[PDB]
């Protein structure tokens, strides 16, 4: 296969695995708690016990949770679980059938009929036959991932049936609820609620998880691929303002990465410094061309003396392919230093009130990639704010910053190649600052100035002011991807119907706009005739097209008048 695709696959899999690991870590606690609760019931009437999970407003993200809980409970050999999707429980019959069949299949899965004959009696008999004297009872768990989408009657009758059959069967059921328990209490009456005895369980919301994955993954120095501030902000925007879908973020990110690496073989260089050189060896003239064509290369071809070298670059590929291992080196090292600098500045800017420049590392990342930090008044304000605390607070603060960046350098840069370099470049500055702190009103501004010139100025540079060929590792071109992901068709239809970018329909649309809210067909036709047997047919088909699009509706509010639905 192509190299860029191989790098794409590798990167994507790494990232996905990382995110998956983070999610597993996030779920592990509540999971263990749930299992503990289930076995707790397994140990030691008339009422079935239940556990409510407050997974608010992201139903499709927390299926892996229940799946993991299934796997864990199966691993525990403590119980067998069936899951009932509100779509499979339109009626009570379908619910009980799906339940029994599910449990049977689950047992079949663990041990390693048809739905038409899945009665509760058959389940009870089956349970009695397989294991009634274990002696330690198993448990029948019944997961309801989508509590909000359930039918009240079916749910109540189901809960009543399950509650009735307790003692003889050890039933348990978990309630994956989006809204608070108010929905549970609102959906169920008291004579049904008096058979539940629930225990509320909480899971971290999507925002915290996003901050986590963002902080731990996209900002990790391990990955050579980076998102531009605008893209980063766009994803976090569409996440925080619309769907709280981690999945949607992951997929958008995936689309960005895919869209990025599909630029050509030239972007195969976006890898560890070691794996890139082979690709440099493997590159071809077209790749040299496309890496020549991109920005931040002309300024590099401009800033240079001895024009024979300039022509050597522009003409000879083999000579340009000798600069790559230095340019790439500089870029990777630069972004390494960049993250290492973020880790330090964020501790210094975050704690402050107002939070003008940023509070989280992602905010700084965006704000730094977008524009220069020194030019913006937020940074100046931050300095103005920093120069007032003084005393043990400031010292302790800068100390926390230094300790943090140090720990980060030891933990997150050591194992990485080019880590010796980054450490060798950054550590002495941290030492210098540490001394400048150990020296500590004037030495304060001295220390701040030192921090500014040693870190912020040279490391936390913007995207405009970035190493030669800062591309490949960074992905801009947010507009196209944005258009391809977001999907705002009505605007396209509007602009396509107003003035064709490339026309009876358009005229009919224009009149349709000119009208107001309700439209007599005759004068509409006459106007359309004023602008332009055959014509009538044209008009009819046009109106039918408008009807098909959904801009106009055939109303009966008046004799032969159409009502437009658009504004």
């Amino acid at each position: 296969m192509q190299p860029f695709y191989e790098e794409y696959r590798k990167a994507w899999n790494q990232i996905n695995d990382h995110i998956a690991d983070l999610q597993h870590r996030s779920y592990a606690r509540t999971l263990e708690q749930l299992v503990d609760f289930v076995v707790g019931q397994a140990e030691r009437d008339e009422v079935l016990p239940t556990a409510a999970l407050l997974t608010g407003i992201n139903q499709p993200d927390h299926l892996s949770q229940f799946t993991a809980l299934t796997q864990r409970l199966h691993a525990q050999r403590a119980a067998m679980v069936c899951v009932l999707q509100s779509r499979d429980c339109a009626t009570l019959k379908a619910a009980v059938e799906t339940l029994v069949f599910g449990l049977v299949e689950d047992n079949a899965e663990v041990e390693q009929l048809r739905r038409s004959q899945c009665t509760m009696k058959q389940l009870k008999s089956w349970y009695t036959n397989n294991f009634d004297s274990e002696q330690k009872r198993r448990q029948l768990v019944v997961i309801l991932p989508d509590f909000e989408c359930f039918n009240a009657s079916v749910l109540q009758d189901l809960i009543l049936i399950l509650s009735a059959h307790c003692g003889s069967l050890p039933f348990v059921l978990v309630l994956g609820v989006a809204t608070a328990m108010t929905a549970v209490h609102g959906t169920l009456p008291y004579h049904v609620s008096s058979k539940i005895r629930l225990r509320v369980f909480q899971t971290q919301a999507a925002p915290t998880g996003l901050n986590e994955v963002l902080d731990k993954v996209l900002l990790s120095p391990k990955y050579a691929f980076h998102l531009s501030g605008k893209t980063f902000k766009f994803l976090t925007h569409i996440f925080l303002y619309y769907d709280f879908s981690i999945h949607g973020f992951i997929q958008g990110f995936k689309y960005c990465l895919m869209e990025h690496f599909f630029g050509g073989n030239a972007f195969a260089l976006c890898t560890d410094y070691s794996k890139a050189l082979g690709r440099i060896k493997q590159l071809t003239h077209e790749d040299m061309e496309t890496i020549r064509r991109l920005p931040s290369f002309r300024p590099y071809v401009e800033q240079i003396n001895d024009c024979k070298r300039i022509i050597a670059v522009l003409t000879d590929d083999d000579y340009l392919k000798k600069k790559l291992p230095q340019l790439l080196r500089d870029c990777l090292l630069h972004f390494l230093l960049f993250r290492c600098s973020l880790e330090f500045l964020t501790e210094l800017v975050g704690d402050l009130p107002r939070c003008p420049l940023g509070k989280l590392r992602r905010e700084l990342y965006v704000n730094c990639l977008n524009r220069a930090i020194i030019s913006t008044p937020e940074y100046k304000e931050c300095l103005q704010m920093l120069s007032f605390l003084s005393k043990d607070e400031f010292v302790a603060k800068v100390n926390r910053a230094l300790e943090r960046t140090e720990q980060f350098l030891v933990e997150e840069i050591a194992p990485l190649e080019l880590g010796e370099a980054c450490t060798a470049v950054l550590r002495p500055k941290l030492e210098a600052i540490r001394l400048a702190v150990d020296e500590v009103g004037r030495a304060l501004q001295k220390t701040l100035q030192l921090i500014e010139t040693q870190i912020v100025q040279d490391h936390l540079r913007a995207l405009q002011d970035a190493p030669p060929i800062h591309e490949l590792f960074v992905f801009s071109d947010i507009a196209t991807v944005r258009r391809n992901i977001i999907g705002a068709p009505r605007a396209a239809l509007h602009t396509a119907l107003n003035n064709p970018h490339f026309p009876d329909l358009s005229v009919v649309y224009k009149l349709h706009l000119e009208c107001g809210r309700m439209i007599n067909l005759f004068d509409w036709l006459q106007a359309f005739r004023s602008v332009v047997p055959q014509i009538q047919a044209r008009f009819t088909r046009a109106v039918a097209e408008l009807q098909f699009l959904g801009y106009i509706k055939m109303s009966k509010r008046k004799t032969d008048h159409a009502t437009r639905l658009t504004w």
């Binding site: 020549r292 064509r293 071809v301 024009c307 024979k308 300039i310 022509i311 522009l314």
Partner: peptide, 19 residues
């Protein structure tokens, strides 16, 4: 600005530098 025109321009500047 186009890439080929830029390349040609720098090439011309080089040919001018050689002179």
């Amino acid at each position: 600005e186009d890439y080929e025109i830029w390349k040609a321009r720098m090439l011309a500047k080089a040919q001018a530098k050689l002179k």
